[PDB]
Write a protein that binds this ligand. Structure first.
Ligand SMILES: Nc1ncnc2c1ncn2[C@@H]1O[C@H](COP(=O)(O)OP(=O)(O)OP(O)(O)=S)[C@@H](O)[C@H]1O
Ligand SMILES: Nc1ncnc2c1ncn2[C@@H]1O[C@H](COP(=O)(O)OP(=O)(O)OP(O)(O)=S)[C@@H](O)[C@H]1O
Ligand SMILES: Nc1ncnc2c1ncn2[C@@H]1O[C@H](COP(=O)(O)OP(=O)(O)O)[C@@H](O)[C@H]1O
Ligand SMILES: [Mg+2]
Ligand SMILES: [Mg+2]
Lengths: 329, 256, 336, 348, 240
């Protein structure tokens, strides 16, 4: 009963080939030139979560060998064991033999190598270059400080830039062609801004919004549907809260904040992010306003990250904003 | 539905003990011809392939071709829980679910019905054993095991060389070096001790000793092991069973 | 099974059994209910304040999906009671995820919609190590067609960025007296709790963003009222006396002491107050309410007192001495 | 005295009639009792009231309890040894004994108790839930409280958690939510004076007037345990003859803390800091927690009349800061000494 | 003054090697009939009751209580034995070749519970070695063994993580070997569950007897009987 439609939109729309990977054009073009010319150096993909590293490496493994890549490619992910003994036995044996299936250079894909111990990386530091004419190494990472400098220097560094807006619009258009659905321009822009580079959250919230229409073939996903599905504060309510905090007095500002955060069940952690994102564009006529505005708000965010209270932190944010916006006058 | 009732009990035990510490996850493909299975190493260097026809089973009934994947450790755990005097019955429903192993004693009514939850393996079935080997040979399993576990003490790599009517096993290490040179000869009063060789081109290629030490463990099944070697091809170490065959495809080391 | 539920406390007695029982989050329950008629269920990440319906809504969804028969054999549940470590996440979680879905019987296949995937619910994933969540990444991505993952937490920050990215997020809103009074009215009607006109509003206001605490408070108040057998209703002060709320008169005395008085007077009164058992968090919350809501103070005082109360609450939320923190807060607000 | 003179029921508790009435209301229907969390000051009789409640819901044979030993094993081969105060109707655990292995004992022991059922012969197995008392729940690590979070909701028909604790702040919000919150205020001077009077009439102590009982009540700060333990010590020191001129016997650690406060107020020097470090080492080495040490040191430094409002404000600020630091540290002295240094910077 | 004698130390060593792992402090009653030992575990799940007949020399003037540790008992017993104690037995002397070992008594709050022969919906008996093998085989799969007695059939099942085991046995009686016989008397179809760690410890008593009796009732604890008589009262899990 397991069909292709039984997958979440995060994995249902996984790029099969390199042509279906958008955004990282500068890396994909050179990777295609690498595989066409025949010299594939040791690759180190470094990128934020949800950019296309693993999808690109699987598409490359498919395009290099064929439609059966897991047969001859060795893939070590964070789910497997990657101790020093593993590097000594398994990886070193796979690197020093020929292929059972085809006749070509083997490919060792070390996914999430930042989770490797320093001893394992030190042991791999020599085996990655002792067997070079037979096997190649691909190291995927999100944090480039866990990798030792020695291992980091032996691999061609490719940084996966976060998905730009155009690529995400292209992928949304592709999905809306592959799925009977309609998306408003303003709702699409709101989704772009909410994505924050992450390509998986786009598809996740897109499926979640397609699930809350009661008819997905005629009704279009409006901005209200997108803002309600994730519980994020709409820019209108955000601007109203900011204006009430800045201009109005304490009682009415507190009342407005409470009435806005209780009309849709918002969260202070999202209101703070929206407020700082909309406030970083102001033309503060000094350097000490921004200092307090950032310090106090970051302290409040760190305290919220521990779930202390919910009504004291709102008044804390209000007082912090007001006290910060006092050096201007 | 699938019903496979063996003639004895320890037959499947000896069949599974071949890959005890050699491979972990296997996928038995059961058809009307018999049970065929293959499993790739954790390091993807050696591939085990076992075929058992309807000759070893007491009763065999397979309606449609089924594929049951399972881990070998749990399979050995289930198999050790059965006495060697009962009968073993592999039972599978219409859709592939947890395989049912059945132990029935022949004198007292003792029904041991174990269920093994199947593993979902990416069964990427290839097409092997269809390639021409430039050299083939066959020799007793005891002599091969002796040579392997005697040369394994001097090094970790073993170079096999098939030349004009001569087989050579060379072990080059640190404490020294060893070389065993055998020649094809066929005895008539003892046909089982004969060493046969058919070569078309000279062959020289190396293998690891850690994998040969696990391959020679299959010598408990048969007494005459066959070895097929070819350049740019895996080495075929085949043990012939009374009903099928168990073959290891070993990947040769890359020399500089 | 009905007698066992009747004997159970109201928290478990009235636990939601279907997706229509959770009358709290219409933004996250509809997405799961529409998954029934569909087949694509994403990796779920329920996050929110304590006592909002996460652990109950996930059980209700699994039930409504599989049925009580297939429920035991189709879902794995790893809570904080179990040993969740890097080794366990590597071996057992991967073993259960890399498994074949159980065969549904004709009864289950006819009555309940059986999806072609199992469900691994890791409850309270904010207690896991970072290495375990790192190892979970490709485990919850490769076997995505036969296994889905539902994480539950109170702090979305504690979960690593890859897991938050891969999972579909669901923020469970707090439960105040506006969107949760219907459930409390249902409980009071089903248990013959003779409440006052607006006492349920006060109950839901005391339990800020929490329904389980409100249900327990209502159960305890009903028990304390039925013990005497008088038959009169349960007033608001009767509820907030046992809820930990300090009486308003004592709070006014504290405000009068801090409004004018030296260090020694405030210290002596704080010692006398701490002699009685009062939760410092509740006292700080009530002080903040009374001061911010009031209009007799200027904004330059309101900002400073808001920051002071925030600092005191952040200190108290680290398991510190309530007496010392309360005395320091009162002295600080007195310095203004 | 604290021993042999103790209410073993609810009709015998002679203080906080409101709390006794609430406990009776809770004990009215035993089979519907939710999880309970008692909080309040030390020496208030929380454990006594909990045992009285247990005797009220179960039979009167709950007090005959026995100490059993249990061996557990961590991830490594390190074997740990704990004790359980088990009665035919309940069991008491103090997980604070383990340093950082509270999660293991909590999960394993609680699951072992919750899976199986109670026995009979006190009609073969039928019995109600088995109570599990958790003493000093504040010292529970956050991971142990997390592991306990689900055990209450998963198995509620067999396990009811009555947890005693003081200064409820180091209790996570989910645990604070999933149980009733009962407070135990310290008894007033009058009720504790009557408690002391009943003791001195039963023990036949020779007192002149009732003023000494009120002085003991005012000196014990409300701790009934401290009150009885100091009345007995004072009776022993004066040969069972109480006089209006009797020195209030302060425990040794409070006297050391007072000497340290005098040393801080008098000499604000670095050598004085080394000497106070030595005194703090000597105090900590004799099993005195750093939190109560800091609390008593702060409330003694605030008591000297030689300092004005500003010094006291700075002292209480530094005390709150370093108490927050101590709640997030392991090496206790490393904070305490520092706090003292700040006080030395405050006075001069 | 109590004084008992065993012709061989084996009869007293095998029993203690059997029941030393679960309990450590057991109270023994000495009277004209025999030794009656009783103990309850720490979690109140398994009550052990041992009965040693005096036919296994015996001299006891009045029934007395005693308590002795089994760890040191197996330590010294790693040749006839004689156990003796005087009035107010603060010390028990064991004479073994001539030797004397004096052990001190521990105060036990041993509330003497009555041993009554109630009615049981199911009572069966099966060889000890087969039951120990079945338990040792099923414990590898799961940690909870379910015993189901229905319609003249016994069923030991265990639903684990890697799979599920289910051994179904029918009553069988043999003439050529009287030891391999399975007797059964049932009045109501029953199905209970028990912990595998308890049975893993109970099956060590397989060297005590050649057969083991299983007595199971609806709401009563399970009875594991070894014929020196030894009965275990095991408490199931409630339901789910
Ligand atoms: N460049 C891209 N083009 C198209 N789809 C993308 C792209 N990047 C991510 N996606 C989508 O996001 C899914 C997950 O992307 P992955 O490449 O697996 O994430 P990742 O690069 O491995 O980052 P990690 O490992 O989680 S930190 C894919 O299956 C696609 O559906
Ligand atoms: N949305 C809801 N609808 C109805 N009852 C609810 C709801 N949320 C909570 N309750 C009640 O509160 C009890 C506990 O709910 P839970 O789902 O365990 O809360 P929670 O989200 O798990 O809090 P945690 O696990 O500490 S973060 C339930 O058994 C119900 O009685
Ligand atoms: N109502 C009472 N009458 C007499 N003595 C009491 C009463 N309540 C408490 N006590 C005494 O207080 C002593 C200590 O109480 P304790 O349980 O240690 O309080 P806490 O639980 O707060 O630490 C007990 O020994 C008991 O004798
Ligand atoms: Mg990846
Ligand atoms: Mg929960």
């Amino acid at each position: 009963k397991r069909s292709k439609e039984n997958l979440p939109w995060v994995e249902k729309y996984r790029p099969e080939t390199l042509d279906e990977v958008y955004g990282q054009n500068e890396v994909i073009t050179t990777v295609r030139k690498f595989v066409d010319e025949g010299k594939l150096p040791h690759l180190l993909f470094y990128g934020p979560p949800g950019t296309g590293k693993t999808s690109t490496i699987v598409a490359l493994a498919r395009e290099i060998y064929g439609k059966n890549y897991s047969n001859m490619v060795l893939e070590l992910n964070a789910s497997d064991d990657r101790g020093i003994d593993v590097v000594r036995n398994q990886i070193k044996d796979f690197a020093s033999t020929r292929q059972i299936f085809s006749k070509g250079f083997k490919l060792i894909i070390l996914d999430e190598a930042d989770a490797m111990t320093n001893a394992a990386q030190n042991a791999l530091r020599r085996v990655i270059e002792r067997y070079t004419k037979n096997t190649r190494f691909c190291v995927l990472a999100n944090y480039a400080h866990k990798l030792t400098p020695a291992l980091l220097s032996r691999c061609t560094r490719f940084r996966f830039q976060p998905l730009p807006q155009e690529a995400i619009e292209r992928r949304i258009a592709n999905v809306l062609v592959h799925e009977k659905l309609k998306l408003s321009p303003n709702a699409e822009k709101a989704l772009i801004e909410l994505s924050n580079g992450d390509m998986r959250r786009v598809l996740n919230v897109l499926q979640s919004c397609k699930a809350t229409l009661d008819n997905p073939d005629e009704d279009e996903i409006s901005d209200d549907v997108i803002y309600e599905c994730c519980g994020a504060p709409r820019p209108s309510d955000l601007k109203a809260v900011l204006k009430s905090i800045l201009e109005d007095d304490w009682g009415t500002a507190h009342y407005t904040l409470n009435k806005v955060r209780s009309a849709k069940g918002l969260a202070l952690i999202d209101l703070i992010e929206g407020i700082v994102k909309i406030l970083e564009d102001y033309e503060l006529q000094n350097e000490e306003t921004r200092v307090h505005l950032l310090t106090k708000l970051a302290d409040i965010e760190y305290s919220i990250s521990k779930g202390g209270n919910d009504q004291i932190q709102g008044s804390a944010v209000i007082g912090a904003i007001k006290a910060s916006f006092e050096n201007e006058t | 539905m699938l019903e496979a009732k063996f003639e004895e009990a320890s037959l499947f035990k000896r069949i599974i003990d071949g890959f005890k510490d050699c491979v972990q996850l296997v996928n038995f493909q059961c058809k009307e011809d018999g049970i065929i299975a293959q499993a790739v190493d954790d390091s993807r260097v050696l591939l085990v392939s076992l075929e058992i026809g309807v000759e070893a089973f007491q009763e065999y009934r397979c309606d449609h071709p089924v594929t049951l994947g399972m881990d070998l450790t749990s399979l050995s755990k289930i198999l050790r829980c059965g006495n060697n005097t009962d009968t073993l019955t592999l039972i599978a429903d219409n859709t592939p679910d947890s395989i049912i192993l059945l132990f029935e004693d022949t004198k007292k009514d003792r029904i041991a019905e174990y269920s093994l939850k199947l593993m979902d393996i990416d069964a990427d079935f290839l097409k092997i054993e269809e390639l021409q080997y430039d050299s083939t040979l066959s020799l007793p399993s005891s002599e091969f095991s002796k040579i392997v576990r005697d040369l394994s003490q001097l090094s970790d790599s073993i170079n096999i060389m098939i030349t004009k009517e001569t087989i050579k096993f060379v072990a080059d290490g640190d404490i020294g070096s060893g070389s065993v040179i055998i020649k094809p000869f066929v005895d008539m009063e003892h046909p089982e001790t004969s060493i046969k060789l058919e070569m078309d081109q000279p062959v020289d290629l190396t293998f690891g000793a850690k994998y040969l030490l696990d391959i020679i463990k299959g010598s408990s099944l048969s007494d005459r092991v066959g070895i097929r070697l070819s350049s740019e091809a895996p080495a075929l170490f085949q043990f012939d069973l009374k009903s099928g065959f168990l073959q290891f495809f070993l990947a040769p080391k890359f020399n500089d | 099974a009905e007698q066992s539920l009747a004997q159970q406390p109201w928290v478990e007695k009235y636990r939601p059994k279907n997706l229509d029982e959770v009358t709290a989050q219409d933004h996250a329950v509809t997405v799961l209910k529409k998954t029934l008629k569909s087949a694509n269920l994403p990796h779920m990440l329920f996050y929110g304040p304590p006592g909002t319906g996460k652990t109950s809504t996930i059980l209700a969804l699994t039930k409504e999906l599989y049925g009580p028969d297939l429920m035991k054999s189709r879902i794995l549940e790893l809570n904080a009671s179990d040993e969740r470590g890097i080794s366990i996440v590597r071996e057992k979680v991967k073993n259960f995820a890399r498994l074949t879905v159980s065969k549904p019987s004709k009864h289950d296949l006819e009555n309940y919609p059986c999806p072609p995937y199992k469900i691994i619910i890791l409850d309270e994933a904010d207690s896991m190590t970072a290495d375990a969540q790192s190892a979970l990444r490709r485990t919850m991505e490769t076997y995505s067609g036969v296994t889905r993952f539902c994480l539950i937490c109170n702090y979305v920050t504690r979960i690593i960025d890859p897991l938050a990215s891969r999972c579909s997020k669901f923020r469970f809103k707090a439960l105040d007296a506006s969107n949760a009074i219907d459930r409390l009215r249902f409980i009071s009607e089903q248990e013959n709790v003779k409440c006052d006109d607006g006492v349920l509003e006060r109950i839901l206001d005391i339990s800020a963003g929490d329904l389980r605490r409100g249900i327990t408070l209502l159960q305890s108040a009903s028990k304390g009222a039925q013990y005497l057998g008088d038959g009169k209703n349960i007033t608001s002060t009767q509820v907030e006396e046992l809820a930990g709320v300090v009486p308003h008169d004592i709070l006014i005395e504290i405000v009068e002491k801090v409004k004018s008085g030296d260090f020694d007077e405030i210290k002596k009164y704080v010692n006398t107050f701490m002699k009685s058992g009062w939760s410092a968090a509740s006292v700080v919350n009530q002080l903040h309410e009374y001061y911010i809501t009031n209009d007799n103070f200027d904004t330059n005082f309101k900002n400073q007192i808001s920051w002071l109360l925030f600092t005191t609450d952040s200190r108290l939320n680290n398991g510190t001495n309530e007496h010392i923190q309360l005395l320091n807060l009162l002295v600080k607000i007195s310095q203004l | 005295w604290v021993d042999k003179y103790r209410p073993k029921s609810l009709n015998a508790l002679s203080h906080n009639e409101e709390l006794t009435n609430f406990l009776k209301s809770l004990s009215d229907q035993p089979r519907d009792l939710p999880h309970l969390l008692l909080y309040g000051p030390n020496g208030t009789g929380k454990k006594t009231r909990c045992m009285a409640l247990l005797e009220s819901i179960f039979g009167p044979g709950v007090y005959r309890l026995k100490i059993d030993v249990r061996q557990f094993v961590t991830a490594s081969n390190r074997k740990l040894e704990l004790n359980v105060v088990s009665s035919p109707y309940h069991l008491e655990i103090t997980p604070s004994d383990m340093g950082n292995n509270d999660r293991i004992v909590i999960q394993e022991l609680l699951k072992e108790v919750a899976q199986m059922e109670q026995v009979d012969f006190q009609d073969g197995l039928a019995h109600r839930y088995k109570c599990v008392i958790i003493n000093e729940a504040n010292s529970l690590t956050k991971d142990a409280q997390a592991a306990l979070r689900r055990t209450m909701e998963k198995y509620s028909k067999n396990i009811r958690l009555i947890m005693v604790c003081d200064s409820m702040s180091p209790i996570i919000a989910p645990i604070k939510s999933r149980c009733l919150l009962i407070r135990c205020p310290a008894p007033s001077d009058s009720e504790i004076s009557t408690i002391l009077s009943d003791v001195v009439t039963n023990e036949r102590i020779q007192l002149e007037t009732k003023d000494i009982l009120k002085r003991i009540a005012q000196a014990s700060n409300g701790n009934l345990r401290v009150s009885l333990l100091m009345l007995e010590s004072m009776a022993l020191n004066n040969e069972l003859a109480l006089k209006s001129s009797s020195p209030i016997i302060k425990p040794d650690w409070i006297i050391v803390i007072h000497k340290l406060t005098r040393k801080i107020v008098k000499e604000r020097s670095v050598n004085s800091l080394i000497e106070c470090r030595a005194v703090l080492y000597d105090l900590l080495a004799h099993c005195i927690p750093a939190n109560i040490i800091l609390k008593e040191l702060t409330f003694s430094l605030l008591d000297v009349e030689t300092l004005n409002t500003t010094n006291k404000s700075s002292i209480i600020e530094y005390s709150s800061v370093f108490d927050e630091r101590l709640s997030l540290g392991n090496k206790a002295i490393f904070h305490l000494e520092g706090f003292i240094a700040k006080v030395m910077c405050c006075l001069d």
